[PDB]
UniProtKB/Swiss-Prot annotation:
One of its GO terms (cellular component) is cytoplasm. The keyword RNA-binding does not apply. Its EC number is 4.3.2.10. This is Imidazole glycerol phosphate synthase subunit HisF. It comes from Thermotoga maritima (strain ATCC 43589 / DSM 3109 / JCM 10099 / NBRC 100826 / MSB8). The active site is at 9, 125.
Amino acid sequence: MQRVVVAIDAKRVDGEFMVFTHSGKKNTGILLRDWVVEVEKRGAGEILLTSIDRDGTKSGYDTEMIRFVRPLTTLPIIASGGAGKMEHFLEAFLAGADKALAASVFMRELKEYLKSGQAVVVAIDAKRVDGEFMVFTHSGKKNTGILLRDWVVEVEKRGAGEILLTSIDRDGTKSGYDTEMIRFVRPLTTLPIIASGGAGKMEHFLEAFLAGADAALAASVFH
């Protein structure tokens, strides 16, 4: 509820966990240790902690990084990058992550087992295509031909605990969240929705919550 989520991407550099920007390409020179605190103090309510070392590998989550960060923050940590098997969610949860972000999918048992507070987050990226909301994969480059409407429903049916809903249309713009898309999606799913793509002012978060978002992601207005 009104959760502000901050995306932190990190990677090992000379045996240190360094924070990266620009899709994990730019070494900011800031230590993961320092940023995680600064972010909490700055007022984040959740951390999406992406391991650039694991991101798309199937080898499992970066449990080392997760354990590294756990002592440093009180915030819920969503682990990201590396998932390939259901146990990995257990593996990440054991390491201290409060949630895990499922790998790019192009779950009903774990959902039942979690009894609460811990969830699997599923990323859905969508875009306007001929006035239709379509799911895209591949950083918004590939249309899947599946309607957002249908996929949100499917995802929930298949036992996801939460949806990370990225608007390819707003992502990178700093012009505000895709409130239209948020509103389209909201009645379709009972899952918490983390809105993503578009933040540019503190006022933009308010708009997303109003549009029906439970949490709002920003990778921009911090890093």
